[PDB]
Nucleic acid binder design. Sequence first.
RNA 1: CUGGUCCACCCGUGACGCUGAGGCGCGAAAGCGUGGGGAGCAAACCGGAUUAGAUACCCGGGUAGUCCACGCCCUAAACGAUGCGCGCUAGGUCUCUGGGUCUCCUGGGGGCCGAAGCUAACGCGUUAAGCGCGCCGCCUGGGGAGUACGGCCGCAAGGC
RNA 2: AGCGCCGGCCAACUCCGUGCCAGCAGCCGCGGUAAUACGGAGGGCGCGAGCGUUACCCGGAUUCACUGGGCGUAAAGGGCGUGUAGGCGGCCUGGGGCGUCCCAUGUGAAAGACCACGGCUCAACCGUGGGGGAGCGUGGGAUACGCUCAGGCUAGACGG
Lengths: 138, 150, 234, 208
Amino acid sequence: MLTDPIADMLTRIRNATRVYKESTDVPASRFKEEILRILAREGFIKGYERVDVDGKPYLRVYLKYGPRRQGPDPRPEQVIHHIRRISKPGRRVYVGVKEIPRVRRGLGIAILSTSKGVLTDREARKLGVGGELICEVW
Amino acid sequence: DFEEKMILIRRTARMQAGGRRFRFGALVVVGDRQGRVGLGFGKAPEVPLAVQKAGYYARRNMVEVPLQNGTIPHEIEVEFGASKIVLKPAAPGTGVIAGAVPRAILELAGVTDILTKELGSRNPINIAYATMEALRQLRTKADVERLRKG
Amino acid sequence: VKELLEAGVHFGHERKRWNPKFARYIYAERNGIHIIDLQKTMEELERTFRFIEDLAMRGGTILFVGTKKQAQDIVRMEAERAGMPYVNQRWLGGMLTNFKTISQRVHRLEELEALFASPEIEERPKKEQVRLKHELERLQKYLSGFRLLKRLPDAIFVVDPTKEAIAVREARKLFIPVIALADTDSDPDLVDYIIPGNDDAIRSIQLILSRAVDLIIQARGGVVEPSPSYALVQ
Amino acid sequence: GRYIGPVCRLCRREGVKLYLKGERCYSPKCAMERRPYPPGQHGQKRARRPSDYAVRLREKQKLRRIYGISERQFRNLFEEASKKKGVTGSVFLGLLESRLDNVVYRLGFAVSRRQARQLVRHGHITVNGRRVDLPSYRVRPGDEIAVAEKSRNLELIRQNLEAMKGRKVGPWLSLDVEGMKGKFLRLPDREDLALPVNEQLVIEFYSR
RNA sequence: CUGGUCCACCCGUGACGCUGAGGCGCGAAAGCGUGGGGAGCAAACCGGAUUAGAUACCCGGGUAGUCCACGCCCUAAACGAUGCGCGCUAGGUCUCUGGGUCUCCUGGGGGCCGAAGCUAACGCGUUAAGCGCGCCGCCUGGGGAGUACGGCCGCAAGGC
RNA sequence: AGCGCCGGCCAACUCCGUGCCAGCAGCCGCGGUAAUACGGAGGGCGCGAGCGUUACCCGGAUUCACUGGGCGUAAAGGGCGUGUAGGCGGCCUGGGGCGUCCCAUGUGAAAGACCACGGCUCAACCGUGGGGGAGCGUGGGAUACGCUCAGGCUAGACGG
Ligand SMILES: [K+]
Ligand SMILES: [K+]
Ligand SMILES: [K+]
Ligand SMILES: [K+]
Ligand SMILES: [Mg+2]
Ligand SMILES: [Mg+2]
Ligand SMILES: [Mg+2]
Ligand SMILES: [Mg+2]
Ligand SMILES: [Mg+2]
Ligand SMILES: [Mg+2]
Ligand SMILES: [Mg+2]
Ligand SMILES: [Mg+2]
Ligand SMILES: [Mg+2]
Ligand SMILES: [Mg+2]
Ligand SMILES: [Mg+2]
Ligand SMILES: [Mg+2]
Ligand SMILES: [Mg+2]
Ligand SMILES: [Mg+2]
Ligand SMILES: [Mg+2]
Ligand SMILES: [Mg+2]
Ligand SMILES: [Mg+2]
Ligand SMILES: [Mg+2]
Ligand SMILES: [Mg+2]
Ligand SMILES: [Mg+2]
Ligand SMILES: [Mg+2]
Ligand SMILES: [Mg+2]
Ligand SMILES: [Mg+2]
Ligand SMILES: [Mg+2]
Ligand SMILES: [Mg+2]
Ligand SMILES: [Mg+2]
Ligand SMILES: [Mg+2]
Ligand SMILES: [Mg+2]
Ligand SMILES: [Mg+2]
Ligand SMILES: [Mg+2]
Ligand SMILES: [Mg+2]
Ligand SMILES: [Mg+2]
Ligand SMILES: [Mg+2]
Ligand SMILES: [Mg+2]
Ligand SMILES: [Mg+2]
Ligand SMILES: [Mg+2]
Ligand SMILES: [Mg+2]
Ligand SMILES: [Mg+2]
Ligand SMILES: [Mg+2]
Ligand SMILES: [Mg+2]
Ligand SMILES: [Mg+2]
Ligand SMILES: [Mg+2]
Ligand SMILES: [Mg+2]
Ligand SMILES: [Mg+2]
Ligand SMILES: [Mg+2]
Ligand SMILES: [Mg+2]
Ligand SMILES: [Mg+2]
Ligand SMILES: [Mg+2]
Ligand SMILES: [Mg+2]
Ligand SMILES: [Mg+2]
Ligand SMILES: [Mg+2]
Ligand SMILES: [Mg+2]
Ligand SMILES: [Mg+2]
Ligand SMILES: [Mg+2]
Ligand SMILES: [Mg+2]
Ligand SMILES: [Mg+2]
Ligand SMILES: [Mg+2]
Ligand SMILES: [Mg+2]
Ligand SMILES: [Mg+2]
Ligand SMILES: [Mg+2]
Ligand SMILES: [Mg+2]
Ligand SMILES: [Zn+2]
């Protein structure tokens, strides 16, 4: 059974972009969808869309990359260079608004889950609230 | 124009009937102190030829460092082999806090304030490459913008 | 220059042992062979030929590379139909990458051709009239298409990139564009301006390189008659 | 007891002339003039390529041997500097230039720093009106550094303060050659100084 | 007589799941106890050779043992020297075993070679040594030492 | 005006003496005749009323790794199961707010530490003022995630 669906999602995305997939599916769940809204809005992913693979509900995640590069190895740059889980079952991580991390000096992001909904480190700071430090992306 | 700093020169040895037959390896950094460095590792029968070959290889291997007022735009950790290197941005007046290897590279890239740390295997050659690669992976808001803009 | 319904030759090539990457350019599976989607063949043609005119009408040298005996001639011909250098014998390791050095051979070539036309021909022991003649012999075997290169090319025209991988690799490294008529077994990504379709079968190599060299003549300005190498398709 | 020994020898070890004597280190005799190679029986031999360490040391040795301050004294300042706000490098220099004995010299009341020091140890100096004999006393901006009311008549005071008549001086200072008084206007900036020393290396020597 | 397991249908229940300190059971060979059995082989041992000398290797004999029943012992290069579960990440080729419309498609196993990637290197590479989450076990320079002491277990050897 | 250094790490070299001796040595290592390493001398480097030595604590040591490590061949996967406690737990909705987060508030002795001004000619030392999170107590608030109680669901598991 899946132990960390969020980590599973973070990974499907990580795994798919390394082989440069078009899209990539992940079993749908509200919370996951919330993470995606952010990834989308932040521009790490072309976007996402609900779908029904084999009757059950999934989430086509449309990955996005850079342009072809020169020299040997034309493989484009990743838009999602890093995407790692922070909080996890058996070691949840929480933070006060005063203790929210600044991922790659703002060039990156951190997705927290607060009592005011899922928000990036900036959004969170704005509504001055902390929560579970879901993961970071950059 | 370009400045060169010799990172290290070693005298390797090989076996043959009769005895050992030597060679020399040399690590050289080349920078304009304007955000451009290059690493070259040249090996030859003689130390000079080695150094020269190294310098020559270095200029052929350059990196455009996104200097933002003597410092790096953001922190990064790069592992090259068993060597890991930690680069952290620093305010002016801080200086270049680094081992001799990363320093030489950083200084010629025109970095003036940076926090640094050598982890894992501290093999000069490998720490050097981890560094160049760290620098090479540095990105700018401008860059992230073009990237996530799409 | 142009052509549409070219099912009279290309498409479908290579058994079933492909390269997953070239799958974007595959149409369907037939009789154990992969049938290439020509629509895309065309699309790439345009995109590529466009790059051809570019280099053409600027004075840009295109180096042709084809050792695959199924076109080792078609190359050395259409290539001569332009000041374009060619390599059809054996791609020598480092022609581009070590160009400076491999050219020293070119110098020794033409230089030897001098000696073999001067009063010093029948001079000195014929023991040298043998060694030196043979030297010229080999030089003329390989470098007789490479001699037209004073500097690195501005593009590389490879027939089968998988086969001419060593060439492509040297290009790639020197940021020299890679033009290639690759197919089913080849790795797309390694080729900049692709032309997906039979990398094997004279009727295909000739057609492509043909119209390609036409567009090179035309684009650079010269107007020439049909290809003097259609007899080779025998 | 600050050093107290042959000085136009240290200039030699540093390969750069240091003003530890004053007016002789000006008239073809600072030794650095016709004999600028280091001291000792091995002075004229080829110098092996210096270790990173060597460089960062000799450098600090220059910067310190200039103001003639002891390592303990010197180090305390650098630390105080590190702590304070702003570029430690420059600040460190500002603090060094604030030492009474030094300002006294920078005002020309004395030729060298060693002499400037002694003029302070013998109360021949006066800050804001009161006497002060602490060469390490820190002159703050706005302080008037005059000559002992009863020492203005002193022979030595005459010469130096005389040769000071008509002779521009430090843009952060101001000499009223008349009442034999000066005025520490502002903490000098690295710009204001022209010291033969890359403070960067000094900061690095302690970084170790 | 009996355990596991794979496939097809998508019929029933509705997380009923994963892991697992202790515990319990299983656990090659040798070995131990009682009683059987004993052809061949063979520690020990008795001889013959070889050799500088052979307490050996080669040769001729040969007891325990090897085999059975019941009980005990509980170790190993007990090895893929890789803990168990789950999801994700090109393919090619051989093979065992199902179902299908049977060139082939689709499952479950066994092998090679290899994308990406990982690795000190050798190598690994949808049987991972990749990318991730869960839980257990274990490591922390060599020698002393798997020894001494204590506890527990065992008839003992000895084991932990 | 002393004391310690000058093979490398580690700033600083040359002669004589001595010939695996006498001795040095923090680690790596020096000495069996031409020793920059022993003893002396001349030089030199580093500090300076101090300089060395020994002992002890933290550091470097991501060398017990929470931040921040590992276990195929380098210590290092338990011989294999079964399963107790425990740790961990698919998708949807609702109640409660334990964890978590947010305001406010009470605590938080002085001293010390940090900052700013001050007093002894400076400083050490000292005084005055300023800031003070955290940790707990209290009151109110939020409910995404984790927990818990209700109901529901078939994609995990298990049945036919
Ligand atoms: K890596
Ligand atoms: K015992
Ligand atoms: K074991
Ligand atoms: K609720
Ligand atoms: Mg993950
Ligand atoms: Mg990542
Ligand atoms: Mg953490
Ligand atoms: Mg050497
Ligand atoms: Mg850049
Ligand atoms: Mg590693
Ligand atoms: Mg190590
Ligand atoms: Mg080739
Ligand atoms: Mg082919
Ligand atoms: Mg400072
Ligand atoms: Mg059903
Ligand atoms: Mg039901
Ligand atoms: Mg179990
Ligand atoms: Mg349980
Ligand atoms: Mg047993
Ligand atoms: Mg047995
Ligand atoms: Mg028995
Ligand atoms: Mg027998
Ligand atoms: Mg013998
Ligand atoms: Mg005998
Ligand atoms: Mg026998
Ligand atoms: Mg076993
Ligand atoms: Mg085995
Ligand atoms: Mg286990
Ligand atoms: Mg297979
Ligand atoms: Mg297989
Ligand atoms: Mg290796
Ligand atoms: Mg393999
Ligand atoms: Mg796996
Ligand atoms: Mg491994
Ligand atoms: Mg153990
Ligand atoms: Mg020990
Ligand atoms: Mg031990
Ligand atoms: Mg042991
Ligand atoms: Mg034992
Ligand atoms: Mg007993
Ligand atoms: Mg035993
Ligand atoms: Mg030295
Ligand atoms: Mg000694
Ligand atoms: Mg001697
Ligand atoms: Mg000596
Ligand atoms: Mg020594
Ligand atoms: Mg000596
Ligand atoms: Mg004192
Ligand atoms: Mg310690
Ligand atoms: Mg530690
Ligand atoms: Mg330790
Ligand atoms: Mg850890
Ligand atoms: Mg370790
Ligand atoms: Mg071993
Ligand atoms: Mg091991
Ligand atoms: Mg082992
Ligand atoms: Mg095992
Ligand atoms: Mg077992
Ligand atoms: Mg749950
Ligand atoms: Mg409070
Ligand atoms: Mg308080
Ligand atoms: Mg208090
Ligand atoms: Mg005061
Ligand atoms: Mg106070
Ligand atoms: Mg329920
Ligand atoms: Zn002088």
